[PDB]
């Protein structure tokens, strides 16, 4: 019953590996659906082709910005942004897919994949999913994101979609 989407990661055009995620619809539907709906690109916009503009080693990997690709843009399927459905799920560790907001009730299309346990984000960011397969792919994306976050090389979402 829980949706499974994926990202085919490419480092500078050359494919690296696939990374699938489990969307916890059974807890946070609207957030869950928006990422599934945007991972498939059914409205005409989404993750295919967008990159991870912000990767901070030992912390997380941020992407989802298909409009301004510099951490400014991106939008939800509901128009601009949306509310904070809930805060039931916590950032328990690496693999956690959560929404990258700009303060409360500002969820759009940006998200981040955790590459370590980030409990200080608990209550401030809506956790809505988790990496099912390919967590070694995000582990590699690592060396390509600096301390400040600027990538050394372009990490891009070559292909993405829904598998179940």
């Amino acid at each position: 019953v829980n949706p499974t989407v994926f990202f085919d990661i490419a480092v500078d055009g050359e494919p690296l590996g696939r990374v699938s995620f489990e969307l916890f619809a059974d807890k946070v539907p609207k957030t869950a659906e928006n990422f599934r709906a945007l991972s498939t690109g059914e409205k005409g916009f989404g993750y295919k082709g967008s990159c991870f503009h912000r990767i901070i080693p030992g912390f997380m990997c941020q992407g989802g910005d298909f409009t301004r690709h510099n951490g400014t843009g991106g939008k939800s399927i509901y128009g601009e942004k949306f509310e904070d459905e809930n805060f039931i799920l916590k950032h328990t560790g690496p693999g956690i897919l959560s929404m990258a907001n700009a303060g409360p009730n500002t969820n759009g299309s940006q998200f981040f994949i955790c590459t370590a346990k980030t409990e200080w984000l608990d209550g401030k960011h809506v956790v809505f999913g988790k990496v099912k397969e390919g967590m070694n792919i995000v582990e590699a994306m690592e060396r390509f994101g600096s301390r400040n976050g600027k990538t050394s090389k372009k990490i891009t979402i070559a292909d993405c979609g829904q598998l179940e």
């Binding site: 912000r54 912390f59 910005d65 951490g71 991106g74 990258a100 907001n101 759009g108 940006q110 980030t118």
Partner: peptide
């Protein structure tokens, strides 16, 4: 402006 801090 979207994003979480370390």
């Amino acid at each position: 402006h979207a994003g979480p801090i370390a």
